[PDB]
Amino acid sequence: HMLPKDFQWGFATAAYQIEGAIDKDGRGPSIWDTFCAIPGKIADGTSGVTACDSYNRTAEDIALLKSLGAKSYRFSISWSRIIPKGGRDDPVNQLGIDHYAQFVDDLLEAGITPFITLFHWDLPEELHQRYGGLLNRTEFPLDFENYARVMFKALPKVRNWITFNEPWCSAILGYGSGTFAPGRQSTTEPWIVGHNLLVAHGRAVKVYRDEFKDLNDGQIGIVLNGDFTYPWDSSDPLDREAAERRLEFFTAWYADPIYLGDYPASMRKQLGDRLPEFTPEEKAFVLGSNDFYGMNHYTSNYIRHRTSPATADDTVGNVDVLFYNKEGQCIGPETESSWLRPCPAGFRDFLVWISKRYNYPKIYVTENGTSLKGENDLPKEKILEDDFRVNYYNEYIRAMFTAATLDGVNVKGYFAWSLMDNFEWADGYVTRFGVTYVDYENGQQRFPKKSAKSLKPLFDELIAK
């Protein structure tokens, strides 16, 4: 009835979502700086120029992280602050490096373990323009590999590294539906982008293990999102299979090559030649390139097989992703995110799914949290109340606990998304995911919500001292 004492817990952000200061200390433009410039791409017509101004408030956030009793903190490095043009032949920005080097020292001094994300969607614009960015099988993995190397040298004190955050998003949403940067819409390119992300990952991991890992006994891994699935009609085997295939398209897409050494068989049979093949060199990079499994999880769905054959523009694996099953049952209540409905049981099920499929690897839950329906349109100290979010964390974390203590899922860490309300990409600022209310009307004042303080006693209970 107790998690291990070295179980890390805390909060998670991303650079472009909280930092602001986009034109500070020589930061180059990312693809998201340009994406937000396009009218209609962002719902509230906003961007991350100010965000939470966390670039300027490192002492304030660190103090907040302490206030809530965080043992760890997951954040991302803005690539274009380190190398403004991104490439392995481009000038390196020391002021960018120093800003993060000082941030790590400030965390270490305040016993908060940094979990660092190398790439959180903010690819330097120059790389996109120079050779096609993520789409380029030859150039991008080499540039990422170098950028990883640079950060490994720059931050010797950091022992917890993440390569890519949610490559599924960068590929499907960035190149399929075009809802995320760079906003391309293709039936072929997402599957090419996904492949490149994998190779870049493998390249960075090898460099880390060979030159930096044994320096301080660290670990590196990729972060994969994925919502669990249940048959829309469990009496129909086509729905049972659909629900499984849907996980394969979402998650095993990246994880099967990293652990098994090849793409899921189900993906190869639908996509065919559109799905790339690993060269020996590429496979040698990708296979076994996880020290730990980085996991993002938010919700679950009912999956209904489709009667028609898979279209060219399909990305979910020829299925219907629903919130009601055939009997009229509902996944969970309505949130501010039409795609997110609470389902704590699905959290534990995904944990066990991963464990069974990949021989029970070390798992870090790098993201977990919820939005709240109509949260942005209600009074201040009523935002500080967030019983809905409190309940979300209570049940989800306890579901994770069961997964660890009963099933024996090797989860060593949990990070709540997010430390505070921030730029929710295409949703803008309308959608709040934070446990801390950020006051944008009044200079991003930090006001912790009821859920923020609820995480300390919850984890106090579940961890063993």
Automatic annotation (TrEMBL):
Belongs to the glycosyl hydrolase 1 family. It comes from Trichoderma harzianum (Hypocrea lixii). Pfam families: Glyco_hydro_1 (PF00232). This is beta-glucosidase. Plays an important role in cellulose degradation. Shows hydrolytic activity against several glycosidic compounds. It catalyses: Hydrolysis of terminal, non-reducing beta-D-glucosyl residues with release of beta-D-glucose. The keyword Endoplasmic reticulum does not apply. Keywords: Glycosidase, Hydrolase. SUPFAM superfamilies: (Trans)glycosidases (SSF51445). Its EC number is 3.2.1.21. PANTHER family: GLYCOSYL HYDROLASE, LP05116P. The keyword Hydrolase applies. GO terms for biological process: cellulose catabolic process. GO terms for molecular function: cellobiose glucosidase activity.
